[PDB]
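Regression test attached.
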Amino acid sequence: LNLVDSVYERLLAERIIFLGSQVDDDIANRLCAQILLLSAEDPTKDIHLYINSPGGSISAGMAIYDTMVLAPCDIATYAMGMAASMGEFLLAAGTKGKRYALPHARILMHQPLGGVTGSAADIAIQAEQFAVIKKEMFRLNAEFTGQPIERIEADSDRDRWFTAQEALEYGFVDHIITSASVNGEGPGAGLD
Amino acid sequence: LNLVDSVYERLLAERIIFLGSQVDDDIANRLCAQILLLSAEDPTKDIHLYINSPGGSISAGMAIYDTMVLAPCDIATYAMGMAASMGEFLLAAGTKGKRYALPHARILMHQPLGGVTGSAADIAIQAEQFAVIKKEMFRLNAEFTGQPIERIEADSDRDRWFTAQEALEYGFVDHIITSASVNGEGPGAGLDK
Amino acid sequence: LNLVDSVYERLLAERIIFLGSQVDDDIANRLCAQILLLSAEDPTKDIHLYINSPGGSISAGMAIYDTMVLAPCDIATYAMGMAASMGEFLLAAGTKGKRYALPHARILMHQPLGAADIAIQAEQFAVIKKEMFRLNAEFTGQPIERIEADSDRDRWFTAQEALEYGFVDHIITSASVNGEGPGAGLDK
Amino acid sequence: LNLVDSVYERLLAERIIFLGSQVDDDIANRLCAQILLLSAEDPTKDIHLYINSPGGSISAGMAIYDTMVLAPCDIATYAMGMAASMGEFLLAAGTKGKRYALPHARILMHQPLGGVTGSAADIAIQAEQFAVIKKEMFRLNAEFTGQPIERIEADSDRDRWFTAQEALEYGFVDHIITSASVNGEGPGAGLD
Amino acid sequence: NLVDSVYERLLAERIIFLGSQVDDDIANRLCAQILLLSAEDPTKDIHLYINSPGGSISAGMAIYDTMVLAPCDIATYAMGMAASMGEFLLAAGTKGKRYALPHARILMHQPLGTGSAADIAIQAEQFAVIKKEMFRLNAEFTGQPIERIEADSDRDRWFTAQEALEYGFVDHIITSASVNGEGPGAGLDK
Amino acid sequence: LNLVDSVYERLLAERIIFLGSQVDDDIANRLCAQILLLSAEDPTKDIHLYINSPGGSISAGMAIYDTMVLAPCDIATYAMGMAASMGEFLLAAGTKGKRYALPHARILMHQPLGGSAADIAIQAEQFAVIKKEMFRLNAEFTGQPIERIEADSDRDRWFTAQEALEYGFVDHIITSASVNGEGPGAGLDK
Amino acid sequence: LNLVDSVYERLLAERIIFLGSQVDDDIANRLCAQILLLSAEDPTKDIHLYINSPGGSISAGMAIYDTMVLAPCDIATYAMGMAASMGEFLLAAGTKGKRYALPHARILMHQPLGTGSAADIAIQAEQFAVIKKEMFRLNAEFTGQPIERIEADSDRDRWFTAQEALEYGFVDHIITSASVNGEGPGAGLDK
Amino acid sequence: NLVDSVYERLLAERIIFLGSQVDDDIANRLCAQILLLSAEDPTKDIHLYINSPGGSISAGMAIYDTMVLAPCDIATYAMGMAASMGEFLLAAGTKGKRYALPHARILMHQPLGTGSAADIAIQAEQFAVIKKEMFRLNAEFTGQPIERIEADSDRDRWFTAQEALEYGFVDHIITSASVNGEGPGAGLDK
Amino acid sequence: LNLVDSVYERLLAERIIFLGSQVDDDIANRLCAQILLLSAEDPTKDIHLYINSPGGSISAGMAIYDTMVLAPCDIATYAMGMAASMGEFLLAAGTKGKRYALPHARILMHQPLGGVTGSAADIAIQAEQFAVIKKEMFRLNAEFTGQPIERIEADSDRDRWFTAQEALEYGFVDHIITSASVNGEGPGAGLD
Amino acid sequence: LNLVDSVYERLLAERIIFLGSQVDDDIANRLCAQILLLSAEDPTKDIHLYINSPGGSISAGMAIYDTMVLAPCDIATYAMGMAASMGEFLLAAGTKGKRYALPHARILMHQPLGAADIAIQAEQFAVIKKEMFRLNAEFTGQPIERIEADSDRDRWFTAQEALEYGFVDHIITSASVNGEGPGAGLDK
């Protein structure tokens, strides 16, 4: 009912979801809940996920990713400003053909933190989980982009970043979107 | 009526409940209330319990569990990110045949805090309660999974953890859900109503 | 749901939105969300962006700008009090012909100062700073080196000087309601 | 809404606006927004701006003033208790003929803060702006009251203040209002 | 919250409550409520209940001017304490409609003297002028000579309800609200 | 040093130490340190432990007790105001013959109800062991049977100075310190 | 100095140092500094380390241990109240023959689980595995127990009374009262 | 306090302690101590004990320049962890006088990049220059090729004491300080 | 005194002063006081001012500079890590011949805050002062380095920075010092 | 007993005291106490008051001034950085012939704004404000109406302008140690 929350709620009614912050457990729960709600309201219409996020934990990002896949809806993704670390991952995880960058977007590859510190197991068990989910993240990024997994890993290690044009050529997105199409003849970006 | 609470309330109308935090007395009260509410609203329709929880006390988790059993309707459970300690327990406690993990969910076994320290009784009485409920936690986890109770105990002792496939194999869930089915040909995950 | 937020929400129903403070990530998220919402509600009706802002982060301002371009509808801009630095940029980014200054508005040009190391952040800052210069040159019709030099010395403008330099298309004094002047979002 | 805000919102339905604190950037935004909203709802009916304000920055007051002029409807102003500094200015800026003082209101002239230090610009650039808007504030106060600009500047320098009757003679307001009229005899004060 | 909800519902009965010290925030809140009630119906009385330990002259004078601005009569009720500017606003109610409850206490007082950016000298000039108006208006409300108002105020003279009736602050003591028709309804008989 | 600490430090020079608050781990560390320090400085001179303590944990109290035993010198104890729970235990643990109560001191028996990285089961095992040993030692200090100690502790039995003397917590009541070598010097005759 | 600090500094002059809290990086720095200082002041006189500690990190404990070995002086250790986790380890690491428990001391074994590193959790885990194994090895060496017994007992948080701790090998003797005349251990109080 | 008092007394033994993360405040503190010890006696060694998890390049380079400015030799001792700039300062000790304790760990690392009022571009230019100098000096300290320093640093390569000796960070492992005369005295033999 | 302050006081006994933080009014007072104290103790011996400072206000730096000149003894300066803005200025203001940079010191030119907003005077009056002291700061930097005033102002405008060797060539310091000399061969750095 | 306070105390032994901040009741108490102490220690030796102050309360400054006059010894004053408002007043109140400005010092004239009611406080403020004007006229030799008018517009001075107007007697550049120039408190 405050202004910002009221606007997000009305955007939800247009099937538009915002990832505008660091990906942590709280944000994952919040985004996961919205994807589930939109799916329940209409499982046949696209969800539009706009991303301006400086990064996030692997664990929290993977929960959002699994919910994107769980949703029977297509999920279009839009690099609105920054898409770094798991923000890059979730952008690239959009339904193929419906992944977009705005022209001044910036995509950052990065080894994020695991987010596996929340439970009271020793560091060895946390490191085990981290190794497995990091390798899975590399593998999925390779599938999203079409790049060899060795390319993904080396670029992640050196924190390679991408302009919108470079991200398009690497394969994180399918198009750079400049202005939304409303009369047909191109992407509507959820603006009908 | 803030945005987060508003979305949770609208999910409640779909009979979807979220366990998104460490399980303590306040979260147990919260979850118990939602299960009772949904049962009272319609005792014939499934409840869908989504779990992304890093752990919790035995005492608090046992109150949720008893309320899950009290509810006349089935409770489907979904490992959405992490189901650790009593979060694993409550996931495995779902209606058999309706326990699910998403493909990258993780399940972690753990010997948790008892949650018995809030009493006005001495530590000897608190320890007596702890020993009883810890043993019963192991026994129930063995019944949920089909594992021998001695394996439950040893694996909990060493903080054994599972990928979603491994958790299905061990017995915590019945199925891995990749995409929800809107077609009847499979689990709807509460999204087809 | 306090009074201030209630008034902003009711203004949203008139397709009026406010950039009333320093541009940062929170403000950018809020403003982008409002632009997307107004676009989705009716992609054929103008959005009216009122600006009274002392500046802010290039990165946040650029994200607002890209959302302005994404929107299918025209975005009219109004310099209400101050339009400084990224506030100037977004004023000048309005749909050409629909950029306005109120009579005592002031426009100020400025070069803002800027998980991966400082080198990566500096590289990203360099591209968006260069883009801000290039686009400011395009909005105003001024040579890019004039934008750079004027920005470097914090050159500022009255409404009439801002009109002559090319940040805005017209000065509005009062709104036209019967429909042959700018209605400033107030004639519906 | 709490009680205070609910009463203000109900007064908004009567086209009554309250300026009850110092004029800073936040208050200017809130005031500008209410003026725009009331204009959009009905551009043919007066707005009634009640003023009990101890002062404010020139820059914030000028933003409010330009929005008062932008409004196609008239803005009646009422000095309810204190109208000091930019509070006096906004009182005097009401639609001529519709500027009122309650019998015990006090009007105070003052040369205030510019409110121009929020920018990242050099203090030389801030002072340039301050000199321009200060001079324009004097010129407009002279236009509002009918006093020569030299008298405005001298009286502001010495923080000259006025009772309601003295404010009427000097030219800040057009009438002292004692009780609102219920049948077109005198001013209704927005309570019609 | 509950408190605000009860006050809002009392507003629908044209009852407003001054239950605290009179400062600028309270002045704004009460002024706003009087204007709102006047706009909603300028022909119906407003009922102003007072339990206030005092407040600033400037803030109390803004309320007083709003009471006089309102076209409605304003009945006033001393509900527990009416001290300093609370006494002033009580005695400022529509004559014939000023009431004290049987155990109410009315206290006279001279408040001591600052939100302007002008020097202390200009602030003291204002205080002197409003202080003298306050005395003059208290004299007119009560029928007492201004010299008696000033002398009694400086010594913090206080009054029981019957003493306040005799002095001239209120017109009646109200023990129980009359739904009879025989007597004041205190706003409780709609 | 501030004033309070300077006075305690100067009292340390007279071999006088204070248990003036609840016995927790921090207090046990400070008292243990003071007992070690005095012992090292002169293992042949008495330490004078003044007690005005409302209680404390068994574990912290037992660490102090063990350090009192470790000390080669006698530890005289003085119930200065209250000696409750582990404060009673430590009073009663003073060198036999050198345990004193001031005339209006009060001694209270009590069962604490009970930190580690181990689970509550291991904590309760340790607690059961130290609780039983505390009852056993209280019996030896006082000469009372263990079952009386346990039952009196369970009901929070308390004692005046004279009652405490008779039960066995202290050996003498001290009213005024002796300067002339007559009786106990209370550490004040150096 | 305040009272507490003043008493600790004066104990330092008697070559007595006090481990009365959880072992973390700050405590390790404080204790390492005191050991170096006493060693510099007189490398021929014992240091007496009194321990009432509920646990601590392996990394912090091992830094203290290496400084204990670096010191040319013998380091006598005393279990004063609790000696748990790395507090047990430091007790058992005292100079052999000069490790002591007071009669009501409790000794608890524990695997301390789990980072101020700039390196990722994988590198931190590699380090932890190395120091954990070395901690088990040394504790086996201090006590005479086989490493597998040390590991299994640590895993189940086995605890010991003073008498059980003596029999297991953590300490060499139980002290009741300090001897000032040479008939037994002086506990650093006989100077 | 006690901690500061022990450090001050160690200063009288020409022993300084880097026990935390290297930031500007730590740089100022350590630089000041090296200058003070140099002024007090420019012919006697300084003993720098290191237990540090890392720190900023700029702050570590200021310390390094002060170590080189000092006319005294500076012996360095890896006491628990020497990571990132802590490794750098360890390896920067006077050659032949760099020591690791047997369970010390040495970690290589590239710190990421801001106190100036200049833009991020000028701050990144500075970081690039100091980062390259850090690699070059690590190569000279260790005898390793600069390419190996950069490659090992980016993967956070870490070392046991024996591995660090072989790689070239330190000259000796010290197990026990020698007051013999046969071996290093670690500053403990004055 | 805590440890840090005790070491600084002992360095004061060696006539060594530390400027290790931003130059504000408090730091200027502390620095001025130490310079006056060392002058009074022995006006014939050098003071050694070690500098590791990220910047500061013009007004505060000018107070320190005037006190450096007031001191009858010489003030040697040493760039220990960073000497930025008024930190560069005070470094360059050392007694000519006795200005030193350590090999990895960095010198940064910058046009800083005036520090003239503490007064109760009008912003116009503050800007007048700022213009005068800024111009004098450029003129003195030109005098210290031997560079023309136009180059000082242009380089300050672009935040030009310098390695120790570049700072030596430009004129901020007279020598790079690597190790202090113990026998009158080279500079003793106050460690003599 | 931190470093900063240790240095000030040691300066006190050179009879040097600092007015380095805004003048308020706390600063006035501290400065009066130092003047009384230095006077009691040796009433024949100069006190050296260094001033770097942006102004403050008339009442607190006047109490410092009265203590300056009470002191039997001369008080030399030094404008070290800023001497504004009551800082200017106390600079100009120094023993005539022993008032000094450092070369880049700035002097600013200013009219500060101001248990008993506001009327009593305003009356007290009026007398000390009038006294500040009268004494400033006496210190400088300027007409009282010039002090008032110049104070009213925040007139400010460089060191040389301050010397010409009469706030100080000399500009000191560097201290004279062998004894035929001002020693600034540094020659003992």
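Expected vs. actual: identical. Residues 114 and 122 of chain C are 7 Å apart (CA to CA).
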